[PDB]
Amino acid sequence: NTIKGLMLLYREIGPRAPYMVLLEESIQTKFAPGGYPLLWSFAMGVAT
């Protein structure tokens, strides 16, 4: 559910969304793993 909301937030940000870390947007913190540690940990499991 949290991931689904984030994708809508990413679409809402605009053309500056991919360069969020470069501009150091405060919205970036909500995107970082830590708000969804369980799925991210599973995601890194298959990724590796």
Place this chain on the structure above:
RNA sequence: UUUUUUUUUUUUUUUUUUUUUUUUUUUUUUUUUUUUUUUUUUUUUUUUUUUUUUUUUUUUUUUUUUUUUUUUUUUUUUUUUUUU
């Protein structure tokens, strides 16, 4: 035709209970660390006219039958007798 029966007799106020006694702020975490140009192949080579047959020969008028012969009037019964 008709012959019975066909008023009434109880009871019918009330007696409880009905306030309250707990809890009810907070103590975590929450940036990032990879990868992400390309390396082949990619014209064509065959074949592709024609050779047969394709008139006709039979039959195809007719021969029977086809009027008629019966029957075809009628002959019974057909008021009433209780009760109410």
